[PDB]
Each structure stands twice: as structure tokens, then as C-alpha cells.
Design a protein around this ligand. Structure first.
Ligand SMILES: Cc1cc2nc3c(=O)[nH]c(=O)nc-3n(C[C@H](O)[C@H](O)[C@H](O)COP(=O)(O)O)c2cc1C
Ligand SMILES: *P(=O)(O)OCC(C)(C)[C@H](O)C(=O)NCCC(=O)NCCS
Ligand code: SF4
Lengths: 71, 366
């Protein structure tokens, strides 16, 4: 989780303390739609995964992303 | 005075060259079909066939199933047979001159329709109404087909290029930058469509600058471009070309003949920006279904054609009061009371309906 938090922090120019599994990228961390895509971009490299858009549209809070990396 | 040659230079996008750097923008449900697009391409510009709602062609001559006088589901709303026939009759007019197919990214069965368009013989595919990161997955068997996303930011350009290279080992053959004065769906949130920050003249240089970073992808400016004076303005700012639609909406060759009747009367204040089941703002005329909703006597919503994914099957149509598939199809059929009608912000400047030939000449002389 600490690695997910670090990419989310650096990408959105936001402290690791705000990146809580409840915090929503839309509302809490202050990201526009393309910030979201860049972020997905950075996560699927960092952890060598692919997140399809269909799967990706569903995630709004960092827990949703954390859980997807998990499985 | 005779017809004079163009100081505008021909435009290369894919393997295809068009004599004049002008796209005729795709216009959804029967506005830019075979007659319009074929004549525009015959005159040396890029004709663009709209692939949306082709089931309505010739009053649904080529559908297998009709429910409630509407094409049933995406298979019939996007009729391959109809699309094939539109392209064939367009090529009766233009021959082998390049043609685009315009496909909104938001549609259900997007990939199938992209493929359909390639098999119908499109040279170029143009796609807006979304961030089309998966345009190439269906084109993999059509190497000769050029792919053009519609964007509203340099940010979008960078994202698209990276995702395309990653997934498809391809980069777009060009980008259309569509500003907020365009017809149909806007690529900005309602609020942002008024700021000065987004005018087309401020966006084009930024997108051009960002595109150089990727081997100088051609940039085509769209939205509010009216005459040659505007064309040269956009080209001086770095655009490789322009895309226009309202002007061609004002031609006789336009496929939805009702517009030849409605634009000359259009007042500027009857052009509104409205909500849409597609989830973008849309610029429309204060007529048809829009007046019926104002009166409370608008048509029943019953999702038959299932045209776009973001609406969720009539849900957002009900939230906004109208079905865009029914409205646009009704307009092509000539229904003045229940049709939905679109226009660019310059629609009100239309007073004479002119031929495509005469329009292309006025834009290209000298
Ligand atoms: C009636 C009408 C229908 C349109 N439909 C579509 C469409 O289906 N797909 C699309 O990408 N753009 C659509 N647009 C946008 C045009 O293709 C074009 O990019 C834009 O209108 C250019 O601005 P102008 O009309 O001021 O020249 C439409 C525009 C008009 C006016
Ligand atoms: P975000 O996911 O809210 O942003 C969507 C964006 C702006 C990325 C998308 O590129 C867009 O809106 N493109 C414009 C498509 C268009 O201009 N027209 C369709 C004409 S009917
Ligand atoms: S209800 Fe929505 S999805 Fe169904 S045809 Fe109408 S606009 Fe399209």
C-alpha cells in the first residue's frame, strides 16, 4: 500500500498523509479527468499491470485502486 | 471573374493527399451522408460521412427490425448495410477521392462500427465525444486507414499518443482540435465553454507546440471557422488544416434537406447550449423537441436504438428530457415538431443556401 500511496502522492502533487483509502481522486485530492488517466498510466507501469478502461472507470477512491492492484 | 487557383497547399494525413487543407466535419444522423460528403470530396476537400444512425437511411430501408418506428438496438441503429450503401453512392460522386467516417467514441458497438467503416471503404476515421484510447484495436486489419482523434487540450494529445504507442505501436495520423463554438457536442464542461482561455485561437498554439514533441503530427483547427480569413488565421498559428461544418450545413448538397429550410431564418438567440444523454453539452437550435419539452408535450422516451453508452439506456435521456437517437433521426426524416436540430455558433450567419462547389471556391480562391 505504501508504494501505491507514493505514486498517488507524487502524481497529484499531494502529501502521502492525504492518500487515505477513503479519499476520492475526484473530490478530495483535486484531480481533473486527465490527471486520472495519467495516474492509472503511472500505476500500471510502476506495478507492471494493465488496467483496462472498463475496469478503470469503476474506481473513484484510492481503496478501489488498492484493491485492484491486489488481485 | 473566372475561378482562380488556390494558394493553399495540399494536405497529407495518411497515405492520402487532399488538394485543399479543409475537412468537412462529420454531422450526425444523415446530415453529411453520400451526397454531401461525395460532393465535398469531389471538389478537393475531405468529405466525412457520419456513421451514426445510419439505420435511418432512406427511412430505414436497410434494417432487419423496427420497434416503435425506431431501429432496434445498435445493430440496426448502426446498420452496416446502410453504411455500405452510403459510401457506395458517395463514391459515385467522388470516385477515389479520400473520405472520412465520423464515429463518436461514446456509441455502443464502437469497435464494430469502426471496422464496418473500414470495410465500407473509409480512408480516414475521425472520432470525438470522448478520449479515444482504443480507436486502433479495431483497425489492426486496415493499415491504410488514418486515425484522427478530436481533442480540446494538449494534455489530451500527450495522453492519447502515449496510450496509442503502448497498446498499438501507433501514433495518430493527425489531431483535430475542436473549440467551443462548434456544433453538436462540445468538448468542455458547460461552464468552460465561455472562457477566453479556451477560444480556438488560444488552444491551437498549445496543441501544436505539444504535438511537435511527437514528430509534428498535423493539427486541424475546428469550431467557428467561417471564411478564408479565418482559415488563414488558423494556419498562421500552426494548424495544418481546418475542419468546418456549419458552412456545409448551409449547402444544398446537405443530406438532411430540412436544414435548407431552417438556417436562413435562424436568429442568434435561438441557438442554445443544452444538456445531452452523451454527457457533453450540445449546441442546438430552439426548435423541434426542444420546444416540445418547453411546452410539456415532448415525445415519450423509450430506449429503442440504444445509441450511446453514457446514457445507460434511457436513464439520462429522461434526466435531460429527450432521446438523441430519436430526435436526430426524426430531423433527418423531416419532422419539424419532434426533430432535434444542431448548429455551430455561426449558424445565424447563414442567409443563402449555396452549392458545395461554390462554397469550396469561395474558401480556396487565391
Ligand atoms: C449539425 C451538426 C452535427 C454535428 N455532428 C457531429 C458528429 O456527429 N460527430 C462529430 O464528431 N462532430 C459533429 N459536429 C461537429 C462538426 O463535425 C465540426 O467539428 C464543427 O461543427 C465545426 O465547427 P463549425 O460548425 O463552426 O465549422 C456536428 C456539427 C453540426 C453543426
Ligand atoms: P474527462 O474524462 O471529463 O474529459 C473528456 C475529454 C475532454 C478528454 C474529451 O477529449 C472530449 O471531450 N473530446 C471532445 C469531442 C468533441 O469535441 N466532439 C464530439 C462532437 S458530436
Ligand atoms: S434512450 Fe439514450 S441510449 Fe437509448 S436511444 Fe435514446 S439517447 Fe440513445
Amino acid at each position: 500500500f505504501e508504494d501505491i500511496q507514493a505514486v498517488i502522492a507524487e502524481q497529484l502533487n499531494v502529501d502521502a498523509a492525504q492518500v487515505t483509502p477513503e479519499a476520492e481522486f475526484v473530490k478530495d485530492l483535486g484531480a481533473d479527468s486527465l490527471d486520472v488517466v495519467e495516474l492509472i498510466m503511472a500505476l500500471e507501469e510502476k506495478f507492471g499491470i494493465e488496467i483496462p478502461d472498463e475496469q478503470a472507470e469503476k474506481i473513484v477512491n484510492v481503496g478501489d485502486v488498492v484493491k485492484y492492484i491486489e488481485d | 471573374h473566372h475561378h482562380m487557383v488556390s494558394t493553399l497547399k495540399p494536405l497529407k494525413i495518411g497515405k492520402h493527399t487532399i488538394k485543399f487543407p479543409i475537412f468537412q466535419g462529420g454531422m450526425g444522423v444523415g446530415i453529411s451522408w453520400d451526397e454531401l460528403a461525395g460532393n465535398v470530396a469531389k471538389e478537393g476537400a475531405l468529405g466525412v460521412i457520419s456513421a451514426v444512425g445510419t439505420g435511418y437511411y432512406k427511412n430505414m430501408r436497410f434494417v432487419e427490425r423496427i420497434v416503435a418506428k425506431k431501429p432496434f438496438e445498435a445493430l440496426n441503429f448502426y446498420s452496416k448495410k446502410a453504411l455500405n450503401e452510403i459510401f457506395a453512392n458517395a463514391r459515385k460522386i467522388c470516385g477515389n477521392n479520400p473520405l472520412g467516417a465520423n464515429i463518436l467514441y461514446a456509441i455502443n458497438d464502437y469497435g464494430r462500427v469502426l471496422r464496418d467503416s473500414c470495410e465500407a471503404g473509409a480512408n480516414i476515421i475521425i472520432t470525438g465525444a470522448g478520449l479515444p484510447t482504443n480507436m486502433p484495436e479495431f483497425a489492426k486489419d486496415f493499415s491504410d486507414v488514418a486515425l484522427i482523434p478530436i481533442i480540446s487540450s494538449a494534455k489530451a494529445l500527450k495522453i492519447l499518443c502515449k496510450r496509442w504507442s503502448d497498446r498499438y505501436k501507433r501514433i495518430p495520423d493527425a489531431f483535430i482540435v475542436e473549440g467551443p463554438l462548434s456544433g453538436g457536442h462540445q468538448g468542455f464542461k458547460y461552464e468552460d465553454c465561455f472562457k477566453e482561455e479556451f477560444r480556438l485561437e488560444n488552444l491551437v498554439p498549445k496543441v501544436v507546440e505539444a504535438s511537435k514533441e511527437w514528430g509534428n503530427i498535423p493539427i486541424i483547427a475546428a469550431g467557428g471557422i467561417w471564411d478564408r480569413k479565418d482559415i488563414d488565421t488558423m494556419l498562421s498559428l500552426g494548424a495544418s488544416g481546418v475542419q468546418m461544418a456549419t458552412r456545409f450545413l448551409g449547402t444544398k448538397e446537405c443530406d438532411a434537406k430540412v436544414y435548407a429550410d431552417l438556417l436562413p431564418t435562424l436568429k442568434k438567440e435561438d441557438i442554445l447550449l443544452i444538456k445531452s444523454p452523451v454527457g457533453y453539452p450540445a449546441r442546438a437550435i430552439n426548435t423541434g423537441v426542444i420546444k416540445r419539452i418547453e411546452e410539456g408535450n415532448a415525445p415519450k422516451i423509450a430506449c429503442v436504438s440504444n445509441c450511446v453508452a453514457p446514457c445507460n439506456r434511457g436513464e439520462e435521456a429522461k434526466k435531460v428530457g429527450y432521446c438523441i437517437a430519436d430526435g436526430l433521426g426524426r430531423s433527418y426524416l423531416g419532422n419539424r415538431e419532434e426533430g432535434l436540430y444542431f448548429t455551430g455558433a455561426n449558424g445565424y450567419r447563414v442567409d443563402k443556401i449555396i452549392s458545395v462547389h461554390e462554397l469550396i471556391k469561395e474558401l480556396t480562391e487565391g
